[PDB]
Short mmCIF file of C-alpha atoms and ligand atoms in Angstrom, two decimals:
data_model
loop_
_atom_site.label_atom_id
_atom_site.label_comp_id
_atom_site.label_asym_id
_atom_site.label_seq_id
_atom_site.Cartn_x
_atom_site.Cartn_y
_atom_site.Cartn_z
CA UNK L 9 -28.25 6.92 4.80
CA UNK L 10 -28.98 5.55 8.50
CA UNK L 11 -31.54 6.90 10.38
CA UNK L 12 -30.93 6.73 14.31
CA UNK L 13 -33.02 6.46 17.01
CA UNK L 14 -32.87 8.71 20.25
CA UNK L 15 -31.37 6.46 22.72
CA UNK L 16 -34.15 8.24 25.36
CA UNK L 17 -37.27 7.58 22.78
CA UNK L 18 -35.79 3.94 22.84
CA UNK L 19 -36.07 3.56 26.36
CA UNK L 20 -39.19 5.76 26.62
CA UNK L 21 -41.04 3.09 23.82
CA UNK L 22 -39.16 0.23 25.94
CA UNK L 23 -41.07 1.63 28.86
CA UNK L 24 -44.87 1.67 27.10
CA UNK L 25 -44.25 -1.40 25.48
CA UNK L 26 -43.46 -3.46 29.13
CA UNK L 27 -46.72 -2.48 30.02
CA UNK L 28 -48.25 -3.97 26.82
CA UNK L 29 -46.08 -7.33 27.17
CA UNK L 30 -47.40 -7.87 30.66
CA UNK L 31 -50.92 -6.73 29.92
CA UNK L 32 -51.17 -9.38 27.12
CA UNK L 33 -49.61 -11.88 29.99
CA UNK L 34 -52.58 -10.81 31.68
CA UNK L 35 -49.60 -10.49 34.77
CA UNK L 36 -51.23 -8.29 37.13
CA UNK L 37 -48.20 -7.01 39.62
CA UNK L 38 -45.89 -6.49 36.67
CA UNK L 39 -49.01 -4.29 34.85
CA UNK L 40 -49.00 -1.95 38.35
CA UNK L 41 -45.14 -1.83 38.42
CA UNK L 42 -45.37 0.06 35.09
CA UNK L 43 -47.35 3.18 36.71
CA UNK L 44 -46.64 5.97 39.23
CA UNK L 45 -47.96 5.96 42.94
CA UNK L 46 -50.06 8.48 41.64
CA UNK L 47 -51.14 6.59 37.97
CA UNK L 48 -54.43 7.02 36.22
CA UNK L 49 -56.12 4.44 33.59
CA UNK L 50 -59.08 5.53 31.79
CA UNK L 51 -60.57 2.60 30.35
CA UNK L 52 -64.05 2.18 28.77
CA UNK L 53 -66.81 1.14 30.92
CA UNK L 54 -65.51 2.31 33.99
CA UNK L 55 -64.23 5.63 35.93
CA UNK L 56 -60.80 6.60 36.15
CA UNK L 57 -58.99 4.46 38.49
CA UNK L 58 -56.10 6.35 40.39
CA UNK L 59 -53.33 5.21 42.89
CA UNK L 60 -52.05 1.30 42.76
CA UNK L 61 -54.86 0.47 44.70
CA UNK L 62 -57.55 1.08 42.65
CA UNK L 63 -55.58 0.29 39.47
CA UNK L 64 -54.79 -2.76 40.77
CA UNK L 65 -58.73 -3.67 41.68
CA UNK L 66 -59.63 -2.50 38.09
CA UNK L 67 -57.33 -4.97 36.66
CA UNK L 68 -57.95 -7.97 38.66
CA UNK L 69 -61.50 -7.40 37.25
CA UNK L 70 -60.84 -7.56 33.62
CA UNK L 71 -58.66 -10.62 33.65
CA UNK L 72 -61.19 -11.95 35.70
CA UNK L 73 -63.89 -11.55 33.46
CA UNK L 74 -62.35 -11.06 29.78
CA UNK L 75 -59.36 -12.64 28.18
CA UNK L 76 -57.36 -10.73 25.59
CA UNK L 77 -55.18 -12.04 22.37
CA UNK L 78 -53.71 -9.17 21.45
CA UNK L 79 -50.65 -7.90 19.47
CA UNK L 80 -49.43 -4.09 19.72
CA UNK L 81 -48.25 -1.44 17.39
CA UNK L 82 -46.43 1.39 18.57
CA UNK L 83 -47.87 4.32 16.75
CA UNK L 84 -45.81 7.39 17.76
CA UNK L 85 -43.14 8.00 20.71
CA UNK L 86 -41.97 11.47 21.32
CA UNK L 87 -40.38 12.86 24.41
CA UNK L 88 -41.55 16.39 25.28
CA UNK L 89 -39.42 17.52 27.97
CA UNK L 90 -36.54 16.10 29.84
CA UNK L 91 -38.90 14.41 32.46
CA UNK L 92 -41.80 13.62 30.26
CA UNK L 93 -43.06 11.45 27.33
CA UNK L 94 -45.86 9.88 25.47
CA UNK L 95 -46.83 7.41 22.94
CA UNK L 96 -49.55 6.09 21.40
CA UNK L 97 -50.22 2.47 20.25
CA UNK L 98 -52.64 0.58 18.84
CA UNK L 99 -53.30 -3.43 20.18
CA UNK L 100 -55.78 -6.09 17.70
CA UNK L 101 -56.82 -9.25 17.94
CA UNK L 102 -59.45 -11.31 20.08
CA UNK L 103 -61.47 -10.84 23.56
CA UNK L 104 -62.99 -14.21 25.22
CA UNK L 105 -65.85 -13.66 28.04
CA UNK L 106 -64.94 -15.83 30.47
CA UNK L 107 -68.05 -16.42 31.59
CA UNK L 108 -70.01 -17.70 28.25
CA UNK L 109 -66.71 -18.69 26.53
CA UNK L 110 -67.63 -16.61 23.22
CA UNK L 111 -64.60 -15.28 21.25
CA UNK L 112 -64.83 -11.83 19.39
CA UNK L 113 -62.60 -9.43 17.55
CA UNK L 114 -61.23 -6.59 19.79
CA UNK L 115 -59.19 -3.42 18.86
CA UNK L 116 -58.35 -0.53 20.96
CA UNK L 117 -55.71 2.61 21.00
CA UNK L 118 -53.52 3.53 23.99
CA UNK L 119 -52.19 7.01 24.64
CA UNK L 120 -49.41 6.57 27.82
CA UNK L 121 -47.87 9.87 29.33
CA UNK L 122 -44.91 9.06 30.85
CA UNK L 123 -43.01 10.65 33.69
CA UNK L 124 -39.10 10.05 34.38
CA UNK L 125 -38.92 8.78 37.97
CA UNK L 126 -36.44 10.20 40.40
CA UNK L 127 -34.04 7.32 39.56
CA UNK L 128 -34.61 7.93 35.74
CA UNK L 129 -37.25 5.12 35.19
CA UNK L 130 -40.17 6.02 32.34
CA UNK L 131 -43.19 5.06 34.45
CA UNK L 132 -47.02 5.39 33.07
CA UNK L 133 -48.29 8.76 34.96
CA UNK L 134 -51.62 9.05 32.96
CA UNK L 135 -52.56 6.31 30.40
CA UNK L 136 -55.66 6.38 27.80
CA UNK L 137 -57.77 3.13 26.15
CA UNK L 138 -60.52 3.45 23.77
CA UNK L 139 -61.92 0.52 21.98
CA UNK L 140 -62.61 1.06 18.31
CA UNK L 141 -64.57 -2.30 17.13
CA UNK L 142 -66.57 -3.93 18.07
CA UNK F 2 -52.89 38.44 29.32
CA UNK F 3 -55.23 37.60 31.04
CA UNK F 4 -53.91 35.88 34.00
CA UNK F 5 -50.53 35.69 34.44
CA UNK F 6 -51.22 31.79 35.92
CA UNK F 7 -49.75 29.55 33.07
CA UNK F 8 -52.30 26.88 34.72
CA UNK F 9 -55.29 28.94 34.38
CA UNK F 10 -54.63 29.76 30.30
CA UNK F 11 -54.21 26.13 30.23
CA UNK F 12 -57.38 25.32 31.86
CA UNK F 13 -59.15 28.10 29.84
CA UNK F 14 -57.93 26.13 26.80
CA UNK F 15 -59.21 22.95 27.74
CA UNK F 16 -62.76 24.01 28.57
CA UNK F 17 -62.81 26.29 25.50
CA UNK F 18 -63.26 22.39 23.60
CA UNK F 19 -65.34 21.33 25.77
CA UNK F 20 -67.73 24.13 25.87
CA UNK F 21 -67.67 24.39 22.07
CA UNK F 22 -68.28 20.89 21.69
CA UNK F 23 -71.34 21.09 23.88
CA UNK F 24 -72.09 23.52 21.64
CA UNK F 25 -71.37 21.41 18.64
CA UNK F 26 -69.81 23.88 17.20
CA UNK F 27 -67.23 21.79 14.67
CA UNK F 28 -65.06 24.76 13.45
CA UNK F 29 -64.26 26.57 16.79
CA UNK F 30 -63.35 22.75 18.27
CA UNK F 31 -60.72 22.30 14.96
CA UNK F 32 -59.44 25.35 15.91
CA UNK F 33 -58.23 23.96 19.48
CA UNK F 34 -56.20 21.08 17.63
CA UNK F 35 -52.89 21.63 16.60
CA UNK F 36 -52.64 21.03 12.47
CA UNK F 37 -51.16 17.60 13.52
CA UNK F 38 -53.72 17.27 16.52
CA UNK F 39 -54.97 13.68 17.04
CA UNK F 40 -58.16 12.32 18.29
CA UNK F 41 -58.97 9.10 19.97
CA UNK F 42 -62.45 8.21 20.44
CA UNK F 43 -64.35 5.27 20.85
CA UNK F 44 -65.83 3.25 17.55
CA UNK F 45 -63.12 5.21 15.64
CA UNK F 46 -59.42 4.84 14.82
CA UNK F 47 -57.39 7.74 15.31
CA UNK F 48 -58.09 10.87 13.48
CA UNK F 49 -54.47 12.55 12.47
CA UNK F 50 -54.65 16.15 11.32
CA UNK F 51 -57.24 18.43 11.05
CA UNK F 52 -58.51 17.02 7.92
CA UNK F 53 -59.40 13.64 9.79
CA UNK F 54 -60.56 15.47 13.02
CA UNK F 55 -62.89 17.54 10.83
CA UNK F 56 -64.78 14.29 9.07
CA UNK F 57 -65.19 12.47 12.44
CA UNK F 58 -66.71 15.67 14.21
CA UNK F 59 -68.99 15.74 11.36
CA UNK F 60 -69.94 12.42 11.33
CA UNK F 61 -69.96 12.18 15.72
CA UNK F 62 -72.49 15.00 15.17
CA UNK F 63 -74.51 14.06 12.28
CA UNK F 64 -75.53 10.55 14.46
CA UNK F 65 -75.42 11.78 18.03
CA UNK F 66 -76.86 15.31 19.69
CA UNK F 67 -74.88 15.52 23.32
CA UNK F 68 -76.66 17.85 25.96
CA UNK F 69 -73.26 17.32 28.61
CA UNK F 70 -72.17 19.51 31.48
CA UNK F 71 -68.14 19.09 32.08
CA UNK F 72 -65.88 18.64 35.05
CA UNK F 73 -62.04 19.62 35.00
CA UNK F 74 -60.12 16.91 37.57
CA UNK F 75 -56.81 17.97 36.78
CA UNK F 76 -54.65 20.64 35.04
CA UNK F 77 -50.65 20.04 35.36
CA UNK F 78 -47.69 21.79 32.96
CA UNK F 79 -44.75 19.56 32.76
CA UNK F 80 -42.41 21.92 31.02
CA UNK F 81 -42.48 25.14 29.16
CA UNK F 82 -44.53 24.64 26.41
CA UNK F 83 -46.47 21.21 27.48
CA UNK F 84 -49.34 20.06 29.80
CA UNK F 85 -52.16 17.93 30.62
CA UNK F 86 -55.69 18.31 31.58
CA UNK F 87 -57.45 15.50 33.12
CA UNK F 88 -61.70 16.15 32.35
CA UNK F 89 -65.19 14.20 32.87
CA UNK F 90 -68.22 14.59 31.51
CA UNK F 91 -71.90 13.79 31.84
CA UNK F 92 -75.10 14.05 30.76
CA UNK F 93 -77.20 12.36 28.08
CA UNK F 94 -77.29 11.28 24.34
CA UNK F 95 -79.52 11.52 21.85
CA UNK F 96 -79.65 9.36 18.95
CA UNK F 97 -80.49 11.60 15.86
CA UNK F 98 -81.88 8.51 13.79
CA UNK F 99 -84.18 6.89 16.26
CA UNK F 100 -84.59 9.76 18.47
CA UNK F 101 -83.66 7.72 21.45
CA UNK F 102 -82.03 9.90 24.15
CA UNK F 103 -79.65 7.89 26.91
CA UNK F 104 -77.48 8.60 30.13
CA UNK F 105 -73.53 9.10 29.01
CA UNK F 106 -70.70 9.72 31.13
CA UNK F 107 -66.95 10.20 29.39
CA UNK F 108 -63.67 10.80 30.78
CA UNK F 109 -60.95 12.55 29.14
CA UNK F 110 -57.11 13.49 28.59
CA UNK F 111 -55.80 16.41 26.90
CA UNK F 112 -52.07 16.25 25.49
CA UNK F 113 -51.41 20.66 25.06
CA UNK F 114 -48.71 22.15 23.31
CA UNK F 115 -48.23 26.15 23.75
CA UNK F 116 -47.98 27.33 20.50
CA UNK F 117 -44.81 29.59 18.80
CA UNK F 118 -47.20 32.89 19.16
CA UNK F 119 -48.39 31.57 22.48
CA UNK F 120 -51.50 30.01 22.35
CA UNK F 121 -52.38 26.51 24.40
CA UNK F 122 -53.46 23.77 21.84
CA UNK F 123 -54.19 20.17 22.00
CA UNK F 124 -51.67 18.42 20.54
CA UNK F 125 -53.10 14.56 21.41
CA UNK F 126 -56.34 13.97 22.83
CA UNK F 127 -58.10 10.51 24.04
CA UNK F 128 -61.82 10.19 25.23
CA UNK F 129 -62.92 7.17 26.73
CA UNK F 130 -66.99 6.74 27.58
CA UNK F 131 -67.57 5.97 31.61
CA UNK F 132 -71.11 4.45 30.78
CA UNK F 133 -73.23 2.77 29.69
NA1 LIG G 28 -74.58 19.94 23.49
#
């Protein structure tokens, strides 16, 4: 009967989703904690930010200017090598501008690649958002 | 082969898409998916197979003609028969309804799987526009 889940693809989706959780807490340090020194976001509107640094200086910008109500959906997870990972997701719900205080719908898609650490932590090496609506 | 560089077939793979989709040429960019390739874009859900990748190519270049010139950033394989490519590109857009042309800039990530008689394929990809 039971199906059974890969004790590493639990750990790897435990992994994508602590990004998501602190994301939606709009908790900055514990969003940068989630990547690799050497982490890339590619987010719409803006270039690739790479390193903590600028990852860090791209984030501090969105929460400054956009608030997100958002719940996730993990879409796939599937571990390619011993080392490496990815899953895709899928986060819904609403977007307030700060500034003019007007609510609006918001989905996106996520694709993370993640990278085993030395110390066998799933960190974020390479992550993808697009926003499909509006 | 070609080159015996693993890396270099990869990158030849990569820029293979993005040369045919400056080309719009729809059936030579299915042909770099895997049969369960996915595509995320923006406006669009993901597109899961090649039946899915197929209508949204249509329809991306039914409303949109793209005059881009491409920029690999980074090529890495992670084991065997997987890798990523890291690309940009820029140019402008034209609007094939109202004719208006406009300044775009997109980044992207390629997900590639080598396939069982060799070949590098993209298994996942994600494109994400830069501007405006
Ligand atoms: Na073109």
């Amino acid at each position: 009967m039971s199906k059974i889940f890969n004790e590493e693809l639990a750990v790897i989706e435990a992994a994508a989703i602590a990004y998501l959780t602190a994301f939606n807490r709009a908790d900055i340090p514990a969003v940068i904690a989630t990547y690799t020194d050497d982490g890339v976001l590619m987010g719409p509107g803006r270039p690739a930010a790479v390193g903590k640094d600028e990852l860090a200086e791209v984030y501090l910008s969105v929460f400054e200017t956009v608030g997100f109500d958002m719940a996730y959906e993990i879409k796939e997870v599937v571990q390619t090598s011993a080392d490496w990972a990815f899953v895709r997701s899928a986060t819904e719900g609403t977007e307030t501008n700060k500034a003019t205080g007007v609510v609006t719908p918001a989905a996106y898609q996520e694709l993370f690649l993640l990278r085993k650490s030395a110390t066998g932590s799933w960190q974020t090496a390479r992550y993808c958002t697009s926003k499909i609506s509006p």
